RNA sequence: CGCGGGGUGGAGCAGCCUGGUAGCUCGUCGGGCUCAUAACCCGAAGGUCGUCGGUUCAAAUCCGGCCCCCGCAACCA
RNA sequence: CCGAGGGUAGGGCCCGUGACUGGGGCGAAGUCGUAACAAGGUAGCUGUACCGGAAGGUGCGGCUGGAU
RNA sequence: UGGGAGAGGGUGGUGGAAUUCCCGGAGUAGCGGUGAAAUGCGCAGAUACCGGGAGGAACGCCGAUGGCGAAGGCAGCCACCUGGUCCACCCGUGACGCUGAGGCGCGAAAGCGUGGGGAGCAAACCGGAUUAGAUACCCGGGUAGUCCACGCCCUAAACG
RNA sequence: CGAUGUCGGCUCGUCGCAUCCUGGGGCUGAAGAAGGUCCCAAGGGUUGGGCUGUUCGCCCAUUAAAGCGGCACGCGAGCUG
RNA sequence: GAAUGCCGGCAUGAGUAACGAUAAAGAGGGUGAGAAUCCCUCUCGCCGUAAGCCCAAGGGUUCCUACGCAAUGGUCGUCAGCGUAGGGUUAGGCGGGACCUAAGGUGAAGCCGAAAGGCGUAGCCGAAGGGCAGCCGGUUAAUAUUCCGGCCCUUCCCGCAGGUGCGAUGGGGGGACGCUCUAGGCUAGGGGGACCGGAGCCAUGGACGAGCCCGGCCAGAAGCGCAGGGUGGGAGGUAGGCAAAUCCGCCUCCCAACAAGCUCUGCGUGGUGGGGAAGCCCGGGUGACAACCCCCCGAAGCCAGGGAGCCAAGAAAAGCCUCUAAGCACAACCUGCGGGAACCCGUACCGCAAACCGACACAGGUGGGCGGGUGCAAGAGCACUCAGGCGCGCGGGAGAACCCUCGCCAAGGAACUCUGCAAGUUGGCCCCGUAACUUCGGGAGAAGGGGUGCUCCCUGGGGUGAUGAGCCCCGGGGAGCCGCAGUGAACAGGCUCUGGCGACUGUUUACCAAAAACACAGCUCUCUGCGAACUCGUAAGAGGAGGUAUAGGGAGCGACGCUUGCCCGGUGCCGGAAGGUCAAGGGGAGGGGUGCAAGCCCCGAACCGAAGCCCCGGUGAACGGCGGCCGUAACUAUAACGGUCCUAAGGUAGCGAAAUUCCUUGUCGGGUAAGUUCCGACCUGCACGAAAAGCGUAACGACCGGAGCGCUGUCUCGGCGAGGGACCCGGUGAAAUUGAACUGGCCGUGAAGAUGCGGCCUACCCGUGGCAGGACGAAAAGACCCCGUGGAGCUUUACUGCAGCC
RNA sequence: GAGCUAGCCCUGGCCAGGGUGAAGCUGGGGUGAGACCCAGUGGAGGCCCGAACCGGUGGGGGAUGCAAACCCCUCGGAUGA
């Protein structure tokens, strides 16, 4: 439950921080972190290909277990619940009775000291992973693979969850966090429960500097530029769009769909997204 | 004020040096070009 | 003494382009219904088309002048 | 030393007055509608919300101080 | 101490009817709506029928003129937690009572804030008719809102 | 047009006279005082503010009066901007 | 003979400007052909968080000594960073390599591209990061952690001794990490001493004194002492750490637990080795057998990998340790000890500058460490100073105008002016005191005031030590003294009221704009299901992201408060399996050419046939748009109301002469003696209006308006003074410009503004200080403007293409 | 050609001193328990004053300059985008 501040400076009026109250271990497992190469938005040509990125805080990537079927039927104790600056969710440390240690995405409700497990025989309890065909219909899952053995791809961000709606032959039907209706394969692993830290969205950065701490650099309106730069540049004084509102590269940015038509995934999308 | 020439020997050798030249076609052409003209020095003098 | 568009029963509008033919709504007047008034119903009248000049067998219509009305423009230093 | 008071500076309350502005009251015979009183021709009244030249209307909920 | 009736309250579950939407079949010239109509929808296959799916809200008969609560209010069903109240016994304390300026708490609907939800309904708004007009009544649509969580607001024909 | 810097201010003047003041006049619908109107006359003089970039103009307080115009809309190798 | 021609030579301006910070000079004595300028001395002044010192980069002999003075040096030159010559840089321990990785770079595997080439895992390379063993002194003209002296230490090789399952590019541990704040103990560094050592000194009225002046340390192995860092022990099981594993991980018991112990640093002490001032006498020598002690302050440094809090969550790899495998256990490794071995490159000098970057010995620019003392509350601020370093490589005179920086000013006090521009005022600390408004933080240093020095007296609490004295730090009370004045010098806010715009801190047109612009937290729309969309690339491949719809892209608006109406006809976008049109292709009615024919060959109707477009819908925080004429109320006026025309619908709330109002200095009110501005209103808004957002809003602003108080040389209105120039003399000596010139005024003339023509007038020859009216003065082949079938940037429903997408 | 400049990547370094006093924690009051109030402690912040450092607001000088952007006075930021 987000923490407010007192207006002792103009930016503290609205700055709100995470409660951090579920976190139990303040430095990461040394065996499982590794350097995260900051790109700055540059690609292997040294080219800015994503604009307005760079200069954020230093980080170490915590290696996150996006498979779990690695260790069918080996329980593990929930050793701690940790901060991770590389994702919106928190992370949970797991000590396997195997002796091995891993990190997973902390789901909502998970408690220090509880045991979790993975596999067909597993109980339908928060923190457990199963092949999707084995979780009962109506059950709120997360960390869902998109294809079998290819890794947890969907519902990984703080607060999100996919709910199983039904089954069809080798495939089950998932309502994704966007609201689309997709068929995901049966052998695909997911994890019972929703991701934690749902209060994440109520964070109010507060000042420009906060976004600079995140590596998010100032964004520039096309309207503020010149016509060499942007469809929206130029004019004398201010100026309305004067054409369909567009990106700096030409295409139109209001309503123009851009999913590729002949995509093979289409045979597996049932209904486009929500709201 | 701060002017444009700020000498730095490592910057000079890695940029204009012999070995830098030889690694690209345009660089080899420069050397060929300057051996043809009879230049005394094929490359900036830098002390290392 | 810039380029536009307009002027027609009492009011607001057609008809002009594409000559012969003036029309729509309200209003006005007479009769009704009502105790009465409105509304409503039944009928009627009122426009020589801003003015003058030409073309024409014939001009609201086409051309020209004069009058009046509204509109847009008037920039470079 | 204290000291009437004089000066400088900043507050508090009250009164009178002000371009303009808001509604109010009253005023024999103005204009516009017809909301209410009969089931007043959509029962009314109500707190609230939104809307409309104006009475008012509509929604949500409540009351009979509503009729057959 | 033993008992009893109850939509009293809070949380978490869960059941079927219905409307809507979506898919499939079958099927064809209208459906809808009204005082009459039109707007609207329908040969791009609607309506009406069968089967499947999704989601939200309200709980039919029971049901009463009834019950519960200090008031506002409370109605599928299941469990947990919790209040008030009545009765029988005449067992315990021995006036420990009554009211109550302040204070504090609760407080229908509408409304507000941050998220969520959104089937039906429906201020605003749009269109169709009616009409002298019709910023209405009637019809076809339709956003907030109605619903959940937290926090406000504190009103009433909050009435017996 | 192989450049004549372009408004106003400030500074420094200087000339014209179609004279605002001071001097000399005639006429008066000139009693006196005060004006009006034409004539002669350029010697000297012709204020300080409020407003606006302003020139002008209006306004305040005075004055004998608060004149008009020319000098590349006098004067940026004198200043301002 | 002309091309603002090209190259070179030499003129002109001219003995003119200047000679490069206003930190400052004066004398004596040397030297020498020659001296303001070189050397020595005394005097003066300047820097001292530097203008002193030490590193790094960059420079490349500039270093030292001898000999010189043509050029260089803004003058001079005997001097020099200049010329000639000779000499000078010494390392197992400092730095870099023979070690490690970081971004990045390269790149066996592999992938991709007409060629050249682009990618790419491991690996390699890559440092100012990690890792690794030297400290004090002496010596040279010139090198020193390098030579020497003293005391220490590291690696490799071989040998000896004891010990042990030894053994690695493989497993594991460790290395290993942020920001703010901060404890305990030290150290650097500093202040005082009535104590210790010292050549001396008594001046000019006094002092032989507990007098003045000087100086009272540095390094050091083992040990020991202090303070800290780090670290649980044993056993059982074990499927995980890509083989193994006694190691690590996990689970269980037992013991331990603020500890201890073990381990590692810092500091202290410590055998020993060094150093050692003023003054005097010529860098030296003496002082000197120097003394080398006590107390106080005290780090940002050290113990350190310390502690706590916070969110934005904070490199890698080697060295090192441990585990085992191939192997091997005559080995091998560990420990102690002895002997031997220990290479390459750098080292001079400058280094905030005359040796680096700026064409210059250029008022500019240049990263790190040290940076003393006193006072002022503090401090790296300020003033004066120590050590040390300088007086800026032209001077001497004079004492005009004028300019620059600076000081003061009678009376007035913004009357200046576009504007209080500028300059005054105010100014630190302590105390009292402090408004509207507000988002309750603020506004606030609001405003406004009082205090401040010195002396004597009594006294409260700290740190040290001891609990005391001494030292050091915070205070309180009382009595007094002096001046014009007590933050007596230097450093150090003027304040208030009220509007516009932007919430805010930030950002920007290097070099005419810092703003109202950009950004910004926040709000909405929209795209995107992951081999995401989107971006860069022919591609491979990358970014996105080792992310996953609470995420990522795109666009608008821009904290926050209350809000954001109506129009979907037109354009975009979204939906629509029907219909219409629609290319290649399919089809082949039917025509044609040629042949003797069989044949070969050409044309071709109906018809089947995508996307796109047409058509049907939806859609505004999508592009966008949101009316006219006439009538009407019991005074007048004005119309709640009506009539009618057109539209897709006719501007809603709020706000309005406005950063928008043309007419306009609209009108009325306020302020002023007077107000084209300002503030408040009114509304016929030329031409506001709701996310190119509408109306507000505390706080904020080197933004832009208006007013007031304070106070001033801004002004009336100017005066005087100072220094650096201007002036004179000696030294050195430019410049743009320039057809030639023997170059006057008026009134005319003239290509229409004449020194140069006409007529008149005026005028002896030549300079120097000054002023700017002319030479249509200089500068830049006018930027305005036109022209050229000149050019370029930008746009779009101009044309025609291409990428991309379908 | 990114030794100027603009952005990002990696690895280091720097920011005298003074001032304001958020959360939290403790204690006290409060209550059925609370919220909450008080005091102390604490040491937050694109907080405040102000050197270094980074800037360049106004004025003046300079304008064949000391300088092809400098000098003086003044002014902005200075734990942070
Ligand atoms: K122009
Ligand atoms: Mg907050
Ligand atoms: Mg948390
Ligand atoms: Mg690691
Ligand atoms: Mg990367
Ligand atoms: Mg790369
Ligand atoms: Mg880049
Ligand atoms: Mg991009
Ligand atoms: Mg970027
Ligand atoms: Mg994320
Ligand atoms: Mg997290
Ligand atoms: Mg699948
Ligand atoms: Mg947010
Ligand atoms: Mg970050
Ligand atoms: Mg952003
Ligand atoms: Mg932006
Ligand atoms: Mg723009
Ligand atoms: Mg722009
Ligand atoms: Mg470009
Ligand atoms: Mg373009
Ligand atoms: Mg463009
Ligand atoms: Mg545009
Ligand atoms: Mg623009
Ligand atoms: Mg505009
Ligand atoms: Mg613009
Ligand atoms: Mg447009
Ligand atoms: Mg476009
Ligand atoms: Mg979808
Ligand atoms: Mg620069
Ligand atoms: Mg710099
Ligand atoms: Mg540099
Ligand atoms: Mg170098
Ligand atoms: Mg280097
Ligand atoms: Mg380099
Ligand atoms: Mg090279
Ligand atoms: Mg290169
Ligand atoms: Mg080649
Ligand atoms: Mg040669
Ligand atoms: Mg070369
Ligand atoms: Mg017509
Ligand atoms: Mg007719
Ligand atoms: Mg009667
Ligand atoms: Mg009638
Ligand atoms: Mg033009
Ligand atoms: Mg008195
Ligand atoms: Mg009447
Ligand atoms: Mg009625
Ligand atoms: Mg309505
Ligand atoms: Mg039909
Ligand atoms: Mg059909
Ligand atoms: Mg739904
Ligand atoms: Mg009894
Ligand atoms: Mg008793
Ligand atoms: Mg309608
Ligand atoms: Mg009708
Ligand atoms: Mg709705
Ligand atoms: Mg009742
Ligand atoms: Mg010209
Ligand atoms: Mg010329
Ligand atoms: Mg010229
Ligand atoms: Mg008289
Ligand atoms: Mg006369
Ligand atoms: Mg005169
Ligand atoms: Mg005027
Ligand atoms: Mg003239
Ligand atoms: Mg003129
Ligand atoms: Mg003029
Ligand atoms: Mg003119
Ligand atoms: Mg000028
Ligand atoms: Mg001028
Ligand atoms: Mg001139
Ligand atoms: Mg010739
Ligand atoms: Mg030429
Ligand atoms: Mg030439
Ligand atoms: Mg030449
Ligand atoms: Mg020459
Ligand atoms: Mg010559
Ligand atoms: Mg000469
Ligand atoms: Mg001269
Ligand atoms: Mg000169
Ligand atoms: Mg000079
Ligand atoms: Mg100076
Ligand atoms: Mg000076
Ligand atoms: Mg002397
Ligand atoms: Mg001398
Ligand atoms: Mg000699
Ligand atoms: Mg000399
Ligand atoms: Mg000499
Ligand atoms: Mg000298
Ligand atoms: Mg000397
Ligand atoms: Mg050099
Ligand atoms: Mg010489
Ligand atoms: Mg010689
Ligand atoms: Mg010379
Ligand atoms: Mg020189
Ligand atoms: Mg000499
Ligand atoms: Mg050595
Ligand atoms: Mg070797
Ligand atoms: Mg190619
Ligand atoms: Mg080649
Ligand atoms: Mg390399
Ligand atoms: Mg290194
Ligand atoms: Mg590191
Ligand atoms: Mg040593
Ligand atoms: Mg020697
Ligand atoms: Mg030397
Ligand atoms: Mg051993
Ligand atoms: Mg071993
Ligand atoms: Mg670590
Ligand atoms: Mg790490
Ligand atoms: Mg931090
Ligand atoms: Mg001290
Ligand atoms: Mg150490
Ligand atoms: Mg001796
Ligand atoms: Mg530091
Ligand atoms: Mg440390
Ligand atoms: Mg690595
Ligand atoms: Mg053997
Ligand atoms: Mg070797
Ligand atoms: Mg050396
Ligand atoms: Mg400097
Ligand atoms: Mg030097
Ligand atoms: Mg240069
Ligand atoms: Mg010099
Ligand atoms: Mg001080
Ligand atoms: Mg000097
Ligand atoms: Mg100097
Ligand atoms: Mg003189
Ligand atoms: Mg003075
Ligand atoms: Mg005065
Ligand atoms: Mg005054
Ligand atoms: Mg005064
Ligand atoms: Mg004034
Ligand atoms: Mg002003
Ligand atoms: Mg100004
Ligand atoms: Mg002052
Ligand atoms: Mg002061
Ligand atoms: Mg006030
Ligand atoms: Mg206050
Ligand atoms: Mg205010
Ligand atoms: Mg307050
Ligand atoms: Mg507060
Ligand atoms: Mg204060
Ligand atoms: Mg004060
Ligand atoms: Mg004194
Ligand atoms: Mg200040
Ligand atoms: Mg701003
Ligand atoms: Mg701004
Ligand atoms: Mg705001
Ligand atoms: Mg705002
Ligand atoms: Mg600029
Ligand atoms: Mg420019
Ligand atoms: Mg420039
Ligand atoms: Mg600024
Ligand atoms: Mg600006
Ligand atoms: Mg900007
Ligand atoms: Mg902003
Ligand atoms: Mg906002
Ligand atoms: Mg949204
Ligand atoms: Mg591309
Ligand atoms: Mg491409
Ligand atoms: Mg990645
Ligand atoms: Mg903002
Ligand atoms: Mg407010
Ligand atoms: Mg539309
Ligand atoms: Mg449409
Ligand atoms: Mg449309
Ligand atoms: Mg084809
Ligand atoms: Mg098609
Ligand atoms: Mg448009
Ligand atoms: Mg339109
Ligand atoms: Mg509204
Ligand atoms: Mg107005
Ligand atoms: Mg306005
Ligand atoms: Mg404006
Ligand atoms: Mg306007
Ligand atoms: Mg105006
Ligand atoms: Mg005007
Ligand atoms: Mg006026
Ligand atoms: Mg008006
Ligand atoms: Mg817009
Ligand atoms: Mg606009
Ligand atoms: Mg405001
Ligand atoms: Mg404000
Ligand atoms: Mg600002
Ligand atoms: Mg500003
Ligand atoms: Mg004023
Ligand atoms: Mg003066
Ligand atoms: Mg003389
Ligand atoms: Mg001379
Ligand atoms: Mg010379
Ligand atoms: Mg000649
Ligand atoms: Mg001649
Ligand atoms: Mg002459
Ligand atoms: Mg004459
Ligand atoms: Mg003429
Ligand atoms: Mg003439
Ligand atoms: Mg002449
Ligand atoms: Mg002649
Ligand atoms: Mg002649
Ligand atoms: Mg002549
Ligand atoms: Mg003549
Ligand atoms: Mg002169
Ligand atoms: Mg002249
Ligand atoms: Mg002049
Ligand atoms: Mg001239
Ligand atoms: Mg000329
Ligand atoms: Mg001239
Ligand atoms: Mg001139
Ligand atoms: Mg040319
Ligand atoms: Mg030209
Ligand atoms: Mg030119
Ligand atoms: Mg022209
Ligand atoms: Mg042409
Ligand atoms: Mg032509
Ligand atoms: Mg052309
Ligand atoms: Mg072009
Ligand atoms: Mg161009
Ligand atoms: Mg695309
Ligand atoms: Mg650079
Ligand atoms: Mg460089
Ligand atoms: Mg700092
Ligand atoms: Mg600071
Ligand atoms: Mg304080
Ligand atoms: Mg405190
Ligand atoms: Mg705490
Ligand atoms: Mg302060
Ligand atoms: Mg500040
Ligand atoms: Mg100034
Ligand atoms: Mg200064
Ligand atoms: Mg700042
Ligand atoms: Mg500051």
PDB file of C-alpha atoms (C1' of nucleotides) and ligand atoms in Angstrom, chain E residues 29-30 41-44, ligand 49:
ATOM      1  C1'   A E  29     -39.826 -11.710 -45.227  1.00  0.00           C
ATOM      2  C1'   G E  30     -40.219  -9.346 -42.072  1.00  0.00           C
ATOM      3  C1'   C E  41     -33.373  -3.315 -37.241  1.00  0.00           C
ATOM      4  C1'   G E  42     -33.716  -7.183 -41.618  1.00  0.00           C
ATOM      5  C1'   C E  43     -32.109 -10.952 -48.081  1.00  0.00           C
ATOM      6  C1'   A E  44     -24.733  -8.421 -46.064  1.00  0.00           C
TER       7        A E  44
HETATM    8 MG1  LIG I  49     -33.193  -4.401 -46.567  1.00  0.00          MG
END
